Design a protein around this ligand. Structure first.
Ligand SMILES: Cc1cc(C#Cc2ccccc2CNn2ccoc2=O)nc(N)n1
Length: 207
């Protein structure tokens, strides 16, 4: 297991999301589904010129899986997936400028719900999760497990769990007072309100 430190700017963003009083937490879902949609659009586009890129799975969809026993809400997509390089450097590099812009916008009057317009919506997951685990598999890389409870660091390890073929699984270990996001009617409500026109099937599993 490798332990890495977030760039100061991203750690700052995460603490703001965790510390700022902001009731409209449900927007975290739209941000994650949006990321999944972008990842699906990407593998889709790439397969138009290299069909073999779908040998790891032709289905392009999103699964939303709640589990009360483990108190988790998992967002699963069969998108392009992330490389180890994305996990350690690429994503953080891009998020740096997005965070700055977002920060400046906030002090200018914007609010947390607009985080997605700055390209760093992923971190909104910390509005409802005490810990986030990301299992991902990109075509020319191994399957990895990324994890972070914020606090300034994250870990990456080669994942030996059940292989997923291709895609990303964001596991949200929900905070004790945010279990409403495990309820089918609540998830259904949120998807209908903020993600009704996603161009991929979104299946809401039931417990
Ligand atoms: C390929 C792909 C990418 C994403 C994403 C993202 C994204 C976009 C902007 C800033 C930070 C991130 C993610 N950062 N993450 C997620 C695990 O390790 C990280 O550093 N989400 C999905 N579902 N699929």
């Amino acid at each position: 297991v490798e332990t890495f430190a977030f760039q100061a700017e991203i750690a700052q963003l995460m603490s703001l999301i965790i510390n700022t009083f902001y009731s409209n937490k449900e927007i975290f879902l739209r941000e994650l589904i949006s990321n999944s949609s972008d990842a699906l659009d990407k593998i889709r586009y790439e397969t138009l010129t290299d069909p073999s890129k779908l040998d790891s799975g032709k289905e392009l969809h999103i699964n939303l899986i709640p589990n009360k026993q483990d108190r988790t809400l998992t967002i699963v997509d069969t998108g392009i997936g992330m490389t180890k390089a994305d996990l350690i450097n690429n994503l953080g590099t891009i998020a740096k400028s997005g965070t700055k812009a977002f920060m400046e916008a906030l002090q200018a009057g914007a609010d947390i719900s607009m985080i997605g317009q700055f390209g760093v919506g992923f971190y909104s997951a910390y509005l409802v999760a005490e810990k986030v685990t990301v299992i991902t598999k990109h075509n020319d890389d191994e399957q990895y497990a990324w994890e972070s409870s914020a606090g300034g660091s994250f870990t990456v390890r080669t994942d030996t769990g059940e292989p997923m073929g291709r895609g990303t699984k964001v596991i949200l270990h929900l905070k004790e007072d945010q279990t409403e996001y495990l309820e089918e009617r609540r998830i259904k409500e949120i998807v209908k309100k903020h993600s009704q026109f996603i161009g991929y099937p979104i299946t809401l599993f039931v417990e």
